[PDB]
Nucleic acid binder design. Structure first.
Lengths: 115, 69, 217, 69, 125, 79
RNA sequence: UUUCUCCCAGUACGAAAGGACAAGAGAAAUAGAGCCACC
């Protein structure tokens, strides 16, 4: 998953995320009461020397039964206003985010690929 | 087989004797009103109980596959 | 006579009566939902009710990589690569929300566990979701795929080269020198192959279970 | 440019008809949007690229306006 | 009950400039209907969003629980998740930039999908 | 069918479209040269004509009309 | 054991602006006591 450090793959078309950079995009903070960040959990990602909130959509940590375990950590950038930074998401995104507590409709609308 | 299925975990190892009593929580203050007040007497045999007793929400085996419609 | 793994009880102090009750429910459920015979390495398509969606079922296709659990709680895992993403889903055999089970391709692989396929090349793990079922022969053993997969660079999830794993489906020669294998072989523990304290026999239990299962039918 | 320009006229006509058959959405924008879609893409294209654009429109035409409701 | 036809008529009453509704086939495990709405100004966006929720609560939906409103903080994109439909409300200019309709209308042929790019993440040494 | 009725109606639908400039909207008004009409223009003009008269005009010969009177003749003989 | 959200309810109240309670529900968090069906 994504946590302190834990270099993640930025699945977004945001300018900072889309542009290649020599240092990988790591995380600085997890926006949850617990310290562990999983799918649907807001995080304080770092991109192009800037701090941008990201939403986790996949993790490599073993999950509950009847669920697919991702082989890579995927995140989606979210603006301060709450709208996603990027207008599209490339990696398939689980549809459980809809039922997850929080505001996920905007990201799901931007996520064309659903598994 | 006089087996009771209870939610949650019970302290101790398997095959360990335990003491069972009615819930003392305030919410379930008086549940014995609708239950056998002293106890259930099979000797009376007013009505033979089914071999397996199920809760309404419980899905019995051999039922149709649950579809989330 | 194919006895499914879940029916075989494991060694322990668990009450036999639990297995007897569990088997009856499993047999009763098998009537409602038919559980096809399959082995690790077989590609299966399983239909399950979707909780997030309303009144919509989905079918997922993947190669069976591992079988775990016993009794009503037994589960099976099938692996596939979708949109370039390796995905493994664990399905419980007797879960009420599994509408149907279809064995698209019934086959066996060299090893009983295919966790090393994650370290193998993606193509060995890629399977078309829409691939149609292939014919099978009833009075025969399941086809055994003897293809040896090629591994990715040396850093792996587990040290498959070690004799303990004894993986027979890996092309170690291509990625590992014979000297490296000898280094791995230093953990041979040859007495383990000859130690009878680690042996658990279920043949008698398996044979006894067969008649009981057939009797219920 | 197209393999057959007759399909373009037939395809465009069907799209306009679907707009009059589309209730839940606002009929006003759809007519303008479709006209813009035809102008932006179809005016300059290659035979291979044009085949994809018209082919997707045909599926768009033949699939209840491609899910528009 | 609160259904697709009632909401869009209510949207028209509050004068939604542009409404997009996309049905979802049973195979795709998402909401049956995806809805996108336009609104002239953030004040109009706030007003229309409140109106639909108020009508939804009044119009039966007793079995369903109350629906939280998402995106009210944003002045350009407000989205409300109802039981059978999701309405994404935005400004007209914001509508074209995001092109939610293209994503759903063109499931895999949407132009913005290609706009996504990749990167490389080498180590320092 | 009235040939004169079609001509005025055909001219009327041509007049309805705003993008084309009816500087000389004669019965023999040409499209490529007289009105400077592109492929988009002729396509749309047929659409307006098609809607009024029950469509069923295929583009195989529609682009060959090149003038209101020709389509008037094509409309007249197809009804 | 503690926090947060929802509900009550845009109601009570208030000219408006604004905006509660109590009761109920759902989420987590940590502490304590346990447990191995699954991972």
């Amino acid at each position: 998953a994504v946590q302190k450090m834990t270099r993640v793959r930025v699945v977004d078309n945001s300018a900072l995320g889309s542009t290649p950079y020599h240092r990988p995009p790591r995380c600085i903070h997890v926006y949850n009461k617990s310290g562990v960040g999983k799918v649907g959990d807001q995080i304080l990602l770092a991109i192009r020397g800037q701090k941008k909130k990201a939403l986790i959509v996949g993790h490599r940590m073993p999950g509950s039964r009847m669920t697919p375990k991702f082989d890579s950590n995927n995140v989606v950038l979210i603006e301060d206003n709450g709208n996603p930074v990027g207008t599209r998401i490339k990696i398939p995104i689980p549809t459980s985010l809809r039922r997850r507590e929080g505001e996920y409709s905007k990201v799901l609308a931007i996520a064309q690929n659903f598994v | 087989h006089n087996i009771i299925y209870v939610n949650g975990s019970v302290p101790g190892h398997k095959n360990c004797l335990v003491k069972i009593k009615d819930s003392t929580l305030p919410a379930y203050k008086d549940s014995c009103k609708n239950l056998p007040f002293p106890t259930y007497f099979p000797d009376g045999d007013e009505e033979e109980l089914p071999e397996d007793l199920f809760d309404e929400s419980v899905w019995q085996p051999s039922e149709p596959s649950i579809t989330f419609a | 006579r194919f006895l499914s793994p879940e029916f075989i009880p494991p060694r322990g102090r668990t009450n036999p009566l639990k297995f007897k009750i569990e088997r009856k429910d499993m047999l009763d459920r098998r009537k409602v939902l038919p559980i096809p015979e399959f082995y690790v390495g077989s590609i299966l398509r399983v239909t399950t009710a979707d909780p997030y969606a309303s009144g919509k079922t989905s079918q997922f296709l993947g190669i069976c990589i591992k079988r775990s659990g016993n009794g009503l709680g037994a589960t099976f895992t099938l692996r596939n690569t979708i949109e370039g993403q390796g995905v493994e889903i664990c399905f419980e055999l007797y879960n009420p929300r599994i509408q149907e089970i279809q064995v698209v391709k019934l086959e066996k692989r060299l090893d009983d566990n295919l966790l090393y396929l994650r370290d193998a090349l993606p193509e060995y793990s890629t399977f078309d979701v829409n691939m149609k079922p292939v014919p099978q022969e009833a009075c025969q053993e399941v086809p055994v795929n003897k293809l040896k997969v090629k591994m990715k660079p040396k850093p792996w999830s587990k040290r498959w080269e070690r004799p303990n794993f004894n993986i027979k489906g890996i092309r170690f020669d291509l990625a590992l020198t014979e000297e490296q294998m000898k280094e791995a072989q230093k953990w041979n523990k040859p007495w383990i192959e000859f130690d009878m304290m680690r042996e658990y026999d279920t043949s008698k239990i398996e044979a006894a279970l067969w008649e009981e299962i057939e009797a219920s039918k | 440019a197209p393999w057959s320009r007759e399909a373009v006229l037939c395809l465009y006509r069907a799209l306009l008809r679907q707009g009059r058959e589309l209730r839940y959405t606002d009929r006003d924008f759809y007519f303008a949007s479709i006209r813009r879609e035809f102008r932006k893409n179809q005016k300059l294209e290659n035979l291979e690229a044009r085949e994809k654009q018209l082919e997707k429109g045909l599926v768009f035409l033949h699939s209840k306006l491609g899910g528009l409701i | 009950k609160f259904d697709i036809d009632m909401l869009v008529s209510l949207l028209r009453q509050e004068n939604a400039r542009d409404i997009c509704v996309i049905q979802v086939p049973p195979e795709m495990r998402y909401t049956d209907y995806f809805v996108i709405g336009s609104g002239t100004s953030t004040r109009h966006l706030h007003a229309m969003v409140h109106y639909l929720v108020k009508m939804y609560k009044h119009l039966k939906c007793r079995s369903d629980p109350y629906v939280k409103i998402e995106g009210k903080d944003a002045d350009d994109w407000l989205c409300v998740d109802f039981g059978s439909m999701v309405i994404h409300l935005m400004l007209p200019e914001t509508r074209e930039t995001y092109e939610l309709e293209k994503l759903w209308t063109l499931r895999s042929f949407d132009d913005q999908l290609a706009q996504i790019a990749a990167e490389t993440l080498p180590e320092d040494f | 069918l009235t040939l004169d009725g079609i001509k005025d109606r055909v001219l009327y639908v041509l007049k309805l479209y705003d993008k084309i400039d009816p500087e000389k909207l004669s019965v023999n008004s040409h499209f490529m040269k007289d009105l400077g009409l592109d492929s988009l223009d002729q396509v749309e003009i047929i659409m307006a004509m098609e809607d009024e008269f029950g469509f069923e005009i295929p583009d195989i010969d529609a682009e060959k009309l090149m003038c209101p009177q020709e389509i008037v003749d094509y409309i007249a003989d197809k009804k």
